[PDB]
Symmetry: D2
Subunit: 251 residues, 4 copies
């Protein structure tokens, strides 16, 4: 595969429906050696299983909310991968209360803090802790959403976090590019993961007349982390069937 | 003046060089009734002096880092302005050690936290606190910079915070539009305030062949807060002499 | 008025509903001295009538489809306005058969040709013709629409022409900036002029909860052509109530 | 390869340095059957040669300036490929005089016409003439340049053409997407093809600190025309090493 000989760490794999799962699935298919992380014990076993299926026994725990945790995870990873070629950041979160109803009423300083810390800072936090471990040609990838570019109902504060994240991508790519490291993000269209009325609207108005799948994303992700996309960095590639580039298709 | 009859609150005045300062005068010239805030004991003096010059004597203390300080400030403002027509958010801060050198190495979880909190959340926290006090036809304005759309050396984490802020503009605009509130931002070009080699560069490659002044920004601010801009909301108006829409002008 | 002392040329007035019309009044209210153009024998009458109402009696013929017509018009304008301060370009046209049904099937090489020629080249052809007549501090303005940034049903080729036009704005702004000329565009939201189901939709999903008026556009136009916008050039200001910065509002 | 079983027509191959050449090179490597076109006789032989090297004897002539020519080319193609899966549009041109010096002085109505007809309309012209021949899952790709988004010195009218082209991409993707056809473009960074001082500037300021190669582009092109990018349509993927997402790196 076009990922043969690459070593990629994959975060955010919670189930078979997780985008991270579809990405891992596709990267493995292309010959990449994988390593996974899991937030907490409630998933350790379940995650080790998905890992086995992809020829991996490198299942490390990591809470990106804690620097010590991230450092510890990369220390372990180091034991088996003194060097690797990048990682996939598939982490997003905001206290439930934040995601429903009028944005201005819902948002809270604390809600804002957490959503930005976890959904945006953790990305650079991770790059920061494994920077000396990256081989030339490595690639870092994160997942964003249209809520960052446009004001979407109920998405609220998660929208500001994604925008912060999309800028993090540009600053990260600009800082690390000189040492042979590329950084990008994939703005995926809506998908059904760990709303239904929405996927309905999306399907009818999206150009390809269907919502994207973790497979469609997995393939773009694999591409974006392979040498095939060597000329791409700091980009936010839209993988939403062209949903965002059209308007008033509903009418 | 096209602002006569409008009661606008102006934050961030620090000195005659301040942007909020250039904005206050322009708004004053156009006939607006102003209120001023000051962050601490160090600035109160200078803020009252300037306010006096612009016919105002409503100088309230406020530290956007604290919700209580914001509620209290708006409580005091209520005694004199039961209702008003918007406010200018000219507040931006990142711990010094953050805006220097390689971005990935300078940024830290705390610096990131403070930057976003003071530069982005403070804007909506303020809208939160005075939402009921706003008259239909009110307008909210904040100041952003190009580091939000593109990776600019040394601007580092502020770039992420400004992006979060420009997204805030969109969400706030979308949430408050129904009750008659517009929300926009001015992405101002560089201005020497409270760097020389950068200005020299900008003046040479900027279409109008000079950097913008707090008067230029001031006039655009007065406009964005007057009923003349009634058809603009959730927008980021570039007031940088067209610098950002050009490329490779140095050559 | 913030336009007193300015001599501005306004093209495209066709009726009291016309956008250029809403612009002429606003500019007049603010104290601008205006000149008017008319395309053919069918419109001359109505244009002179309106001009008279706004204190002007400079009604010149001009068909932007012909370079000679443009040179001649500016030659006549020279007799009364040796120099002036800019002009409003409110001209847009595509052969009828182009704006209906599937884009790929409707478009044709000729329709494409005419659309771009009348909607985009005419703007710079006009700047060409009067470049020496423009005073430092002059401003040029054109009108665009969202179909330039996103694919909108039935707008078809006009969408391509508007994009060419918005790019023209940038190049013209960059070329003329050094001699003191600013060049901007207003991307106006939909307005019923010389479609009902579309408006109903827009009013519901637009942040301010209504479609913009030629007054809204008019006031923003006066501003973009006054020295108040001295810090804005090569910009595309969205005057659509924030419609474009929202997404999935229907749901 | 990930293009196994796909049939792609490739235009714009003029030499070994042509981007089209690097794209063909990479698509062939991935198992795609190719077909080529050549503008005029002066290239027939030379193009047939490049074709042989890629297992192709399908070398058809085609002047995109003429509808009859395009129809004739697809008629021939039909004889050998009654059905295929998309094509690569690598065609750009503007009368020499147009590309140097102040844009406003250089541009001419005729210059504008040709540049837009050849560099932008031909893309949809081709889609139009082969629409019934595309299998579900087909993909159309065109090449754009940053000059479309920003005002670049000397690029002049070619900048407006590229913008028109980038919008054509969105409208084309929106119209054809429902029949299982995707349409995208690659905004490539500068490359040395059939200026030097510029590649210098680009290298020092680009994040990956180097200009992209026809190889880097060829790979993105192959990806964009393969089922791996099934979730991408109407997008303008930047393959310039992240040049456009950074600013003031020169300082
Ligand atoms: N599902 C969609 O519609 C969609 C669309 C576009 C982009 N995205 C983005 O893609 C990413 C993956 O989302 P998903 O849809 O696969 O959901 P998911 O719930 O399947 O996976 C997201 C992961 O968040 C991780 N997480 C949360 N807090 C964490 C913490 N403190 N430390 C470490 N890990 C933590 C969990 O382990 C989980 O596996 C997110 O960033 C999301 O915003 C989702
Ligand atoms: N000067 C430029 O080059 C430039 C360009 C574009 C945008 N901006 C933006 O414009 C705004 C004003 O900047 P400036 O150049 O006038 O600088 P300034 O230092 O003169 O003013 C900024 C204000 O930040 C306020 N502040 C910081 N923390 C605060 C807190 N916790 N509570 C209350 N107030 C607090 C201070 O009182 C200060 O007056 C900023 O948001 C800045 O990012 C500046
Ligand atoms: N009305 C809307 O919904 C809307 C929204 C956004 C932008 N716009 C843009 O604003 C501008 C004005 O449109 P309008 O709605 O006022 O329509 P309108 O028909 O009232 O006015 C447009 C003008 O086009 C002029 N014109 C066409 N070909 C010409 C030629 N060859 N020479 C000289 N003049 C010529 C006509 O004289 C006419 O008055 C257009 O460029 C349009 O694309 C309109
Ligand atoms: N070279 C760069 O720096 C660069 C960067 C980004 C994008 N691009 C774009 O990529 C495409 C390919 O350019 P290139 O750099 O490979 O140059 P090139 O000269 O090698 O190839 C371009 C092709 O234009 C074709 N052409 C011109 N007029 C034609 C007509 N009337 N009918 C049919 N074919 C015609 C020629 O056959 C030629 O092969 C262009 O659209 C260009 O604008 C070039
Ligand atoms: C793109 N998405 C999915 C999504 C959530 C959501 C909420 C409101 C509207 C749309 C929405 N979409 C598409 C995400 O990034 C997920 C965000 C998210 C969800 C729950 C949570 N606890 N933290 C973060
Ligand atoms: C736009 N600016 C000014 C600025 C800083 C900067 C750093 C690098 C490059 C450009 C830069 N510009 C224009 C700002 O927003 C200021 C941010 C700032 C500065 C110090 C501080 N302690 N907190 C915030
Ligand atoms: C913005 N508009 C109005 C408009 C047309 C249109 C078509 C489809 C969808 C929206 C649409 N809007 C807002 C225009 O620029 C008008 C273009 C136009 C109309 C007729 C014509 N003969 N030439 C040009
Ligand atoms: C991206 N490029 C290359 C290029 C030409 C050019 C001219 C001025 C400045 C930059 C420039 N670049 C990068 C192109 O699209 C080619 C355009 C082109 C060149 C010659 C020609 N006769 N027709 C079209």
């Amino acid at each position: 595969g076009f990922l043969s000989g690459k070593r990629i760490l994959v975060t955010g794999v919670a189930s078979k429906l997780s985008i991270a799962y579809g990405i891992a699935q596709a990267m493995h298919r292309e010959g990449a050696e994988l390593a996974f992380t899991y937030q907490n014990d409630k998933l350790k076993g379940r995650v080790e299983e998905f890992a086995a299926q992809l020829g991996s026994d490198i299942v490390l725990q990591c809470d990106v909310a804690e620097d010590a945790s991230i450092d510890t995870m990369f220390a372990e990873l180091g034991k088996v991968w003194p060097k690797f070629d990048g990682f996939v950041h598939s982490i997003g979160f905001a206290p439930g209360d934040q995601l429903d109803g009028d944005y201005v009423n819902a948002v809270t300083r604390e809600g804002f803090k957490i959503a930005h810390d976890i959904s945006s800072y953790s990305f650079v936090a991770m790059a920061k802790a494994c920077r000396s471990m990256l081989n030339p040609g490595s690639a870092l990838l994160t997942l964003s959403y249209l809520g960052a570019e446009r004001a979407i109902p109920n998405y609220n504060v998660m929208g500001l976090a994604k925008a912060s994240l999309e800028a993090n991508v540009r600053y990260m790519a600009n800082a690390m590019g000189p040492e042979g490291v590329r950084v990008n993000a994939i703005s995926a269209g809506p998908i059904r993961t760990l709303f239904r009325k929405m996927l309905a609207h999306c399907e009818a108005v999206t150009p390809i007349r269907r919502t994207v799948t973790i497979e469609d994303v997995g393939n773009s992700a694999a591409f974006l982390c392979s040498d095939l996309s060597a000329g791409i960095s700091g980009e936010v590639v839209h993988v939403d069937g062209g949903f965002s580039i059209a308007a008033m298709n509903e009418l």
